[PDB]
Design a protein around this nucleic acid. Structure first.
Ligand code: MG
Ligand code: MG
Length: 540
DNA sequence: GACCACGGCGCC
DNA sequence: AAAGGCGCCGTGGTC
């Protein structure tokens, strides 16, 4: 096949590499190679050879860049065929799949991976010709974002380990109180972590009424939704609900996170997966830092563990109602656009009609209720499902659905146009032309078809919000470098940065402006910003 | 030790 | 606490 030539490769070569494990912050670089111009070059010693590359160009380029950064080398990621394939079709999420589909095989040898990266890029680049909008997304968003993501991953975030270890002991004792009480109420001990055993106790032994069934295997459900509805049926239910919350938080965050501190950085390093979702969102794994608790009292105590470096502060920026602002722009609805242009709070307007009075002081709970209905109607829930899900008579539900769409006729028209076009072309698109293929828009099984319609009109909204955030990160990153600040985390419509204390206020101002002005829409974008020593404080 | 499907549930 | 989009936990089961 390719001609074998000595290391190092010429500039522009495609790289292949093998890691001992998937997480580049934790991986041993086992082998490194490069392919170009009909030649393949294999590195005698991979870590040393890393020093010869100017760019990581090839499949999974960002992963190699993260390892390089870990080793003190400023090796940026460049072209990556994964990103081309993901823009053609976001179900293209793995190198194994992308290779099979576009002209090779993903193996475990660096030379082969290098040669593969080269051929896949050639082929996929050809596919993106004529695709002007996908090309722009590649050049202006995805390719530059991979470098930003590489820096975020390699930087990591600081965690108060001692605090979490002390917290574990406290939660353990509370969990023991709950499980002892549950077993007494049951009349015998069992495995409270087993939903199958819990099912027998609740519905067979205590004879509580089963309310719902599980999706795939049709067992009587013990989900929080069922338990909430049985809260007053028996005192064991509230205890179980509390046990669920504590064990969830303890097993997922409190116990695992302290063990994941990197020995060299003394920080926690997530992976930001760039080709993992059907809508263009990022995902986070190993550990997932996009789902750190924030709602409950114990969740808030966990979030306080994420702290700024000594002498630095966290800066937290959140887009306000990005998805509804995107929907206003996509649909062109005059009335919805007027809402945002006039700084009015849409969920409060709906809370004036329902729960009113008063317009001035609707109160939190009623607004949360109005929000729930606004989005419910939006996702095409029936007057029946809304009336029963939201403890209100059937008539009220219908009235609100008609009002909602009489106020925003173009939102309805936009949803209808998007579904028809998805059916015809087989895909739907974000504002920037990112695509998702949704085949089941024609299924003859109504539950299947209707689930598809929800996916289909969700994608342009969630996906455009993702495009905007990604473009914002791409724009914001060089500015932070210049100011000596760091970008740490993204959580879909939020960013968390770290800045020296003397510069935190300027960083927050600047970041807020870059985010709000990322790509002007028919409505303003609003960003709320907070500064603090820890992630919870930085929003309070 | 690993994988899996599942139910369940943390976040946006 | 908006929940379509995710990733992780333990169970029960397999290999
Ligand atoms: Mg928010
Ligand atoms: Mg699942």
């Amino acid at each position: 096949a390719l001609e074998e030539a000595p290391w190092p490769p010429p500039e522009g070569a495609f790289v292949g590499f093998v890691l001992s494990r998937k997480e580049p912050m934790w991986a041993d670089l086992l082998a490194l190679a490069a392919a170009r111009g009909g030649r393949v070059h294999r590195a005698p010693e991979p870590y040393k050879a890393l020093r010869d590359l100017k760019e990581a160009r090839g499949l999974l380029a960002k992963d190699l860049s993260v390892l390089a950064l870990r080793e003190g080398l400023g090796l940026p990621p460049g072209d990556d065929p994964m990103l081309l394939a993901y823009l053609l079709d976001p179900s293209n999420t793995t190198p194994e799949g992308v290779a099979r589909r576009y002209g090779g095989e993903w193996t475990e040898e660096a030379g082969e991976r290098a040669a593969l990266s080269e051929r896949l890029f050639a082929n996929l680049w050809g596919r993106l010709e004529g695709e002007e909008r996908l090309l722009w997304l590649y050049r202006e968003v995805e390719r530059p974002l991979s470098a930003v993501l590489a820096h975020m991953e390699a930087t990591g975030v600081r965690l108060d380990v001692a605090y979490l270890r002390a917290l574990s002991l406290e939660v353990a004792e509370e969990i023991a109180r709950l499980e002892a009480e549950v077993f007494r109420l049951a009349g015998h001990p069992f495995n409270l972590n087993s939903r199958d055993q819990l099912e027998r106790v609740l519905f067979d032994e205590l004879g509580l009424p089963a309310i719902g069934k599980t999706e795939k295997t049709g067992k009587r459900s013990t989900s929080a939704a069922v338990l909430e509805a049985l809260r007053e049926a028996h005192p064991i239910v509230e205890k179980i609900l509390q046990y669920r919350e504590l064990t969830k938080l303890k097993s997922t965050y409190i116990d695992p996170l302290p063990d994941l501190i990197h020995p060299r950085t003394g920080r926690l390093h997530t992976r930001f997966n760039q080709t993992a979702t059907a809508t263009g969102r990022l995902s986070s794994s190993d550990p997932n830092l996009q789902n750190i608790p924030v709602r409950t009292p114990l969740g808030q105590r966990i979030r306080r563990a994420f702290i700024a470096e000594e002498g630095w502060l966290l800066v937290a920026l959140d887009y306000s109602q990005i998805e509804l602002r995107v929907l206003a722009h996509l649909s062109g609805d005059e009335n919805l656009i007027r809402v945002f242009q006039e700084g009015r709070d849409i969920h409060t307007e709906t809370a004036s009609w329902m729960f009113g009075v008063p317009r001035e002081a609707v109160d939190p709970l009623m607004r949360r209720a109005a929000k729930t209905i606004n989005f419910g109607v939006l996702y095409g829930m029936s007057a029946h499902r809304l009336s029963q899900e939201l403890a209100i008579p059937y008539e009220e539900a219908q009235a609100f659905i008609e009002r909602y769409f009489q106020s925003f006729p173009k939102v309805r028209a936009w949803i209808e146009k998007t579904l028809e076009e998805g059916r015809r072309r087989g895909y739907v698109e974000t504002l920037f032309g990112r695509r998702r293929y949704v085949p089941d828009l024609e299924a003859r099984v109504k539950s299947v078809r209707e689930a598809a319609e929800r996916m289909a009109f969700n994608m342009p909204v969630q996906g455009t919000a993702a495009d905007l955030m990604k473009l914002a990160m791409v724009k914001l990153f060089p500015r932070l470098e210049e100011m000596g600040a760091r970008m740490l985390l993204q959580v879909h419509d939020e960013l968390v940065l770290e800045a020296p204390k003397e510069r935190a206020e300027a960083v927050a101002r600047l970041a807020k402006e870059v985010m709000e002005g990322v790509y002007p829409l028919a409505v303003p974008l609003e960003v709320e910003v907070g500064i603090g020593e820890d992630w919870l404080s930085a929003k309070e």
